[PDB]
Design an enzyme around this catalytic site. Structure first.
Site, PDB file in Angstrom:
ATOM      1  N   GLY A   1       0.874  -1.234   0.075  1.00 49.81           N
ATOM      2  CA  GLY A   1       0.081   0.119   0.022  1.00 49.81           C
ATOM      3  C   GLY A   1       0.864   1.221  -0.116  1.00 49.81           C
ATOM      4  O   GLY A   1       0.512   2.273  -0.629  1.00 49.81           O
TER       5      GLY A   1
ATOM      6  N   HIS B   1       8.957   4.055   7.131  1.00 47.92           N
ATOM      7  CA  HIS B   1       8.957   2.693   7.657  1.00 47.92           C
ATOM      8  C   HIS B   1      10.119   2.084   7.848  1.00 47.92           C
ATOM      9  O   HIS B   1      10.368   1.151   8.409  1.00 47.92           O
ATOM     10  CB  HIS B   1       8.249   2.072   6.443  1.00 47.92           C
ATOM     11  CG  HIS B   1       6.635   2.485   6.354  1.00 47.92           C
ATOM     12  ND1 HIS B   1       5.882   2.675   7.357  1.00 47.92           N
ATOM     13  CD2 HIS B   1       5.942   2.728   5.135  1.00 47.92           C
ATOM     14  CE1 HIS B   1       4.405   2.855   6.908  1.00 47.92           C
ATOM     15  NE2 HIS B   1       4.534   2.780   5.722  1.00 47.92           N
TER      16      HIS B   1
ATOM     17  N   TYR C   1       9.923   2.918   1.960  1.00 47.73           N
ATOM     18  CA  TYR C   1      10.548   1.837   2.408  1.00 47.73           C
ATOM     19  C   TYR C   1      12.301   1.917   1.845  1.00 47.73           C
ATOM     20  O   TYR C   1      12.814   0.919   1.964  1.00 47.73           O
ATOM     21  CB  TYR C   1       9.831   0.833   1.596  1.00 47.73           C
ATOM     22  CG  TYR C   1       8.771   0.089   2.357  1.00 47.73           C
ATOM     23  CD1 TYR C   1       8.734  -0.540   3.516  1.00 47.73           C
ATOM     24  CD2 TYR C   1       7.380   0.670   1.862  1.00 47.73           C
ATOM     25  CE1 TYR C   1       7.407  -1.000   3.955  1.00 47.73           C
ATOM     26  CE2 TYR C   1       6.177   0.222   2.113  1.00 47.73           C
ATOM     27  CZ  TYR C   1       6.240  -0.724   3.484  1.00 47.73           C
ATOM     28  OH  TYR C   1       5.093  -1.030   4.009  1.00 47.73           O
TER      29      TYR C   1
HETATM   30  C1  LIG Z   1      -4.809  -6.054   7.533  1.00 42.05           C
HETATM   31  C2  LIG Z   1      -3.964  -5.290   6.437  1.00 42.05           C
HETATM   32  C3  LIG Z   1      -2.646  -4.977   6.877  1.00 42.05           C
HETATM   33  C4  LIG Z   1      -1.687  -4.124   5.822  1.00 42.05           C
HETATM   34  N1  LIG Z   1      -0.403  -3.738   6.226  1.00 42.05           N
HETATM   35  C5  LIG Z   1       0.117  -3.156   5.347  1.00 42.05           C
HETATM   36  C6  LIG Z   1       1.695  -2.648   5.714  1.00 42.05           C
HETATM   37  O1  LIG Z   1       2.274  -3.141   6.707  1.00 42.05           O
HETATM   38  N2  LIG Z   1       2.417  -2.009   4.652  1.00 42.05           N
HETATM   39  C7  LIG Z   1       1.866  -1.640   3.401  1.00 42.05           C
HETATM   40  O2  LIG Z   1       2.567  -0.840   2.908  1.00 42.05           O
HETATM   41  N3  LIG Z   1       0.564  -1.807   3.154  1.00 42.05           N
HETATM   42  C8  LIG Z   1      -0.176  -2.630   3.954  1.00 42.05           C
HETATM   43  N4  LIG Z   1      -1.339  -2.901   3.613  1.00 42.05           N
HETATM   44  C9  LIG Z   1      -1.984  -2.356   2.212  1.00 42.05           C
HETATM   45  C10 LIG Z   1      -1.740  -3.784   1.341  1.00 42.05           C
HETATM   46  O3  LIG Z   1      -0.553  -4.034   1.194  1.00 42.05           O
HETATM   47  C11 LIG Z   1      -2.475  -3.454  -0.006  1.00 42.05           C
HETATM   48  O4  LIG Z   1      -3.949  -2.887   0.134  1.00 42.05           O
HETATM   49  C12 LIG Z   1      -2.365  -4.476  -0.929  1.00 42.05           C
HETATM   50  O5  LIG Z   1      -1.285  -4.801  -1.222  1.00 42.05           O
HETATM   51  C13 LIG Z   1      -3.063  -4.055  -2.278  1.00 42.05           C
HETATM   52  O6  LIG Z   1      -3.017  -5.267  -3.302  1.00 42.05           O
HETATM   53  P1  LIG Z   1      -4.428  -5.972  -3.962  1.00 42.05           P
HETATM   54  O7  LIG Z   1      -4.177  -7.140  -4.571  1.00 42.05           O
HETATM   55  O8  LIG Z   1      -5.542  -6.127  -2.948  1.00 42.05           O
HETATM   56  O9  LIG Z   1      -4.891  -4.961  -4.642  1.00 42.05           O
HETATM   57  P2  LIG Z   1      -6.333  -4.242  -4.783  1.00 42.05           P
HETATM   58  O10 LIG Z   1      -6.622  -3.125  -3.917  1.00 42.05           O
HETATM   59  O11 LIG Z   1      -7.498  -4.994  -5.146  1.00 42.05           O
HETATM   60  O12 LIG Z   1      -6.027  -3.272  -5.826  1.00 42.05           O
HETATM   61  C14 LIG Z   1      -5.976  -3.663  -7.103  1.00 42.05           C
HETATM   62  C15 LIG Z   1      -5.931  -2.427  -8.143  1.00 42.05           C
HETATM   63  O13 LIG Z   1      -5.479  -2.949  -9.500  1.00 42.05           O
HETATM   64  C16 LIG Z   1      -6.752  -2.959 -10.176  1.00 42.05           C
HETATM   65  N5  LIG Z   1      -6.863  -4.374 -10.848  1.00 42.05           N
HETATM   66  C17 LIG Z   1      -7.324  -5.672 -10.576  1.00 42.05           C
HETATM   67  N6  LIG Z   1      -7.132  -6.559 -11.163  1.00 42.05           N
HETATM   68  C18 LIG Z   1      -6.491  -6.197 -12.213  1.00 42.05           C
HETATM   69  C19 LIG Z   1      -5.825  -6.610 -13.515  1.00 42.05           C
HETATM   70  N7  LIG Z   1      -6.331  -7.972 -13.658  1.00 42.05           N
HETATM   71  N8  LIG Z   1      -5.158  -5.694 -14.229  1.00 42.05           N
HETATM   72  C20 LIG Z   1      -5.036  -4.455 -13.948  1.00 42.05           C
HETATM   73  N9  LIG Z   1      -5.634  -3.875 -12.817  1.00 42.05           N
HETATM   74  C21 LIG Z   1      -6.201  -4.543 -12.049  1.00 42.05           C
HETATM   75  C22 LIG Z   1      -8.004  -2.854  -9.303  1.00 42.05           C
HETATM   76  O14 LIG Z   1      -9.102  -2.417  -9.613  1.00 42.05           O
HETATM   77  C23 LIG Z   1      -7.071  -1.849  -8.289  1.00 42.05           C
HETATM   78  O15 LIG Z   1      -7.263  -0.511  -8.725  1.00 42.05           O
HETATM   79  C24 LIG Z   1      -2.347  -3.722   4.760  1.00 42.05           C
HETATM   80  C25 LIG Z   1      -3.504  -4.164   4.303  1.00 42.05           C
HETATM   81  C26 LIG Z   1      -4.530  -5.013   5.327  1.00 42.05           C
HETATM   82  C27 LIG Z   1      -5.738  -5.408   4.731  1.00 42.05           C
HETATM   83  C1  LIG Z   2      -4.838   0.687   2.095  1.00 38.04           C
HETATM   84  O1  LIG Z   2      -3.428   1.010   2.490  1.00 38.04           O
HETATM   85  C2  LIG Z   2      -2.956   0.479   3.648  1.00 38.04           C
HETATM   86  C3  LIG Z   2      -3.570  -0.064   4.505  1.00 38.04           C
HETATM   87  C4  LIG Z   2      -3.057  -0.528   5.879  1.00 38.04           C
HETATM   88  O2  LIG Z   2      -3.942  -1.159   6.686  1.00 38.04           O
HETATM   89  C5  LIG Z   2      -1.965  -0.224   6.206  1.00 38.04           C
HETATM   90  C6  LIG Z   2      -1.058   0.655   5.106  1.00 38.04           C
HETATM   91  C7  LIG Z   2       0.165   0.812   5.755  1.00 38.04           C
HETATM   92  C8  LIG Z   2       1.315   1.726   5.243  1.00 38.04           C
HETATM   93  O3  LIG Z   2       1.379   2.293   4.006  1.00 38.04           O
HETATM   94  C9  LIG Z   2       1.018   3.470   3.990  1.00 38.04           C
HETATM   95  C10 LIG Z   2       0.646   4.402   2.920  1.00 38.04           C
HETATM   96  C11 LIG Z   2       0.437   5.667   2.869  1.00 38.04           C
HETATM   97  C12 LIG Z   2       0.351   6.455   4.040  1.00 38.04           C
HETATM   98  N1  LIG Z   2       0.026   7.811   3.977  1.00 38.04           N
HETATM   99  O4  LIG Z   2       0.674   8.497   4.945  1.00 38.04           O
HETATM  100  O5  LIG Z   2      -0.871   8.206   3.043  1.00 38.04           O
HETATM  101  C13 LIG Z   2       0.770   5.717   5.473  1.00 38.04           C
HETATM  102  C14 LIG Z   2       0.839   4.199   5.150  1.00 38.04           C
HETATM  103  C15 LIG Z   2       0.088   0.286   7.019  1.00 38.04           C
HETATM  104  C16 LIG Z   2       1.311   0.237   7.924  1.00 38.04           C
HETATM  105  N2  LIG Z   2      -1.033  -0.490   7.125  1.00 38.04           N
HETATM  106  C17 LIG Z   2      -1.438  -1.135   8.635  1.00 38.04           C
HETATM  107  C18 LIG Z   2      -1.532   0.952   4.157  1.00 38.04           C
HETATM  108  O6  LIG Z   2      -0.949   1.524   3.210  1.00 38.04           O
END
Ligand SMILES: Cc1cc2nc3c(=O)[nH]c(=O)nc-3n(C[C@H](O)[C@H](O)[C@H](O)COP(=O)(O)OP(=O)(O)OC[C@H]3O[C@@H](n4cnc5c(N)ncnc54)[C@H](O)[C@@H]3O)c2cc1C
Ligand SMILES: COC1=CC(=O)c2c(c(COc3ccc([N+](=O)[O-])cc3)c(C)n2C)C1=O
Ligand SMILES: Cc1cc2nc3c(=O)[nH]c(=O)nc-3n(C[C@H](O)[C@H](O)[C@H](O)COP(=O)(O)OP(=O)(O)OC[C@H]3O[C@@H](n4cnc5c(N)ncnc54)[C@H](O)[C@@H]3O)c2cc1C
Ligand SMILES: COC1=CC(=O)c2c(c(COc3ccc([N+](=O)[O-])cc3)c(C)n2C)C1=O
Lengths: 272, 271
Positions: free
Chosen positions: A148, A160, A154
């Protein structure tokens, strides 16, 4: 060619993660690979370690020790069948791909649980043959992570902290410990903020890389030949090796930094 | 004060459980009000899914856990088990995480607890990360038991520096939400420890808890050292970067800055 296993840890088939999994499978089959999958959510995978992972009668049911009972069960052939099915997939695979979104700076709980129940003693690792001498030394593993947060967050100066430190517990502690040669991770940052066209190129770039994935030089981990693999020694680096390092500027790895500078992208770029 | 002890171990006969009972007894004796989260005994579901939201999903065609769980938090549609855990956290001053090290990290059941409980807006905001997180007035501690000896996890041990292993957990999860993280209680090779030595370990843990709250917490780079915005990409402030280039050691394990990591940054307190 060869055999590939793709472990996916995402609940939605509409996610970019599912698309990344599909792209990988297509690219690989196209080059003649046999591709097997472990879609953990799709399989309703049980990620919780318990005595139920042992089918037979335990050695010590009143004082249950998972490591010992699970190993014994593996040896006598009475591990829960769902676990054995995953172990058979692993044994058949040459290449193992882990596709998952980074969650709380690590792997999703469902994948963590997969490691905990599937990587059982003797099968996945042996204290007598750790790291490079492990059971999967003929296999190659790759982490394909979506994030995300942006890549800058990173970098060395991002809030981070260094992604190389985050990757270490997994690539070294889990994968390499079992003998896997770990390839450079496929990192796709801030996928939630990436233009549609850019997302398209990401899938094509992944498929492109997979065409020659097997021939890649793996990430660098300190060889086990550098350590005294025995108890009364404490599994510490051998005497001579510790001396030879005294005059070296850099440490060996993220984990084996030795109080010195960590080579750049040790867990991200496999050119060391 | 109020303490929350989250335990992640299936066996009531384990040392981890013993450690949990020691903490509860020690804290209570000193006047603390103690609450527990025995994940296994609570038959806790560690898997995030749309089942965590009871209300109507904003977008059921494309489920996005982060946005939906945050909306559920605000609208009051979160699964009852998550709500109860969030209430325990909200009331707790001190949170103790008791668990055996599994594959160089926390047990899957505990990883999942974080994933389902630490919901956006509740446990953090992209605006008030780390320093300014929601749990800034709380303190957290990791009490871990391992199969491997302490030397295996030394700078020279085959597993590598434990400080690196602790980083993702203590900084990425705990501190990111605001928690002041206290020094981890590390109980190495608990399986090769004489019966007499384990009793002492239990006693040592109990006496520490007697003054746990007045402990100097672990050092993490303050958020003030960074330009918190996409415009800047959330990187250290130019002044900081330059003013830091004359320092031998990096700021922490994560912010090693390509230099020497300050000794035991994730194990011992010393700003
Ligand atoms: C519990 C939890 C903890 C998290 N902790 C962290 C963390 O520690 N650090 C961090 O950085 N992030 C964190 N995140 C965020 C997470 O890493 C991102 O939300 C996730 O990686 C997004 O991947 P996704 O596959 O869900 O994509 P999605 O959100 O589904 O997004 C995919 C995107 O691509 C599009 N898409 C889908 N299929 C296709 C296709 N075939 N071709 C082209 N485009 C397509 C979608 O419409 C959308 O725009 C956390 C999320 C959760 C729920
Ligand atoms: C759905 O995305 C995210 C969902 C999360 O649950 C999450 C994120 C991050 C870290 O990624 C960040 C991205 C952007 C900002 N920002 O300042 O706008 C902050 C954090 C962390 C640790 N968690 C637990 C996401 O991004
Ligand atoms: C899937 C998995 C992955 C693992 N990965 C790792 C890893 O990456 N790194 C690593 O180092 N280790 C690892 N381990 C090992 C694990 O960390 C140890 O097995 C665990 O920490 C031992 O703690 P325990 O509470 O289970 O204790 P137990 O094995 O139960 O042992 C406790 C000991 O203390 C005794 N005892 C119990 N209660 C009391 C009491 N009240 N007073 C005094 N003595 C008592 C018991 O009888 C026993 O001898 C892993 C284990 C598993 C199952
Ligand atoms: C029940 O204990 C253990 C069970 C494990 O499942 C386990 C251990 C370790 C590392 O700890 C070691 C301790 C001693 C030796 N040894 O030299 O015999 C090797 C490893 C790792 C990674 N795993 C996955 C254990 O100790």
């Amino acid at each position: 060619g060869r055999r590939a296993l793709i472990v996916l840890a995402h609940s939605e088939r509409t996610s970019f993660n599912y698309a990344m999994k599909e792209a990988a499978a297509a690219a690989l089959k196209k080059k003649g690979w046999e591709v097997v999958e472990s879609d953990l959510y799709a399989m309703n995978f049980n990620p919780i370690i318990s005595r139920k992972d042992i089918t037979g009668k335990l050695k010590d049911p009143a004082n249950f020790q998972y490591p010992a009972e699970s190993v014994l069960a593996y040896k006598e052939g009475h591990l829960s069948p769902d676990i054995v099915a995953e172990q058979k997939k692993l044994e058949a695979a040459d290449l193992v791909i882990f596709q998952f979104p980074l969650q709380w700076f690590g792997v999703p709980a469902i994948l963590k649980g997969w490691f905990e129940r599937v990587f059982i003693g003797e099968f996945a690792y042996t204290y007598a043959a750790m790291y490079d001498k492990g059971p999967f030394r003929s296999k190659k593993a790759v982490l394909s992570i979506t994030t995300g947060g942006s890549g800058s967050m990173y970098s060395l100066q991002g809030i981070h902290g260094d992604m190389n430190v985050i990757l270490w517990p997994i690539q070294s502690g889990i994968l390499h410990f079992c003998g896997f040669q770990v390839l450079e991770p496929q990192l796709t940052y801030s996928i939630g903020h990436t233009p549609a066209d850019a997302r398209i190129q990401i899938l094509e770039g992944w498929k492109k890389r997979l065409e020659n994935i097997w021939d890649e030089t793996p990430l660098y981990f300190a060889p086990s030949s550098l350590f005294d693999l025995n108890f009364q020694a404490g599994f510490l680096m051998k005497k001579e090796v510790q001396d030879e390092e005294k005059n070296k500027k850099f440490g060996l790895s993220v984990g084996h930094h030795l109080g010195k500078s960590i080579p750049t992208d040790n867990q991200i770029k496999a050119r060391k």
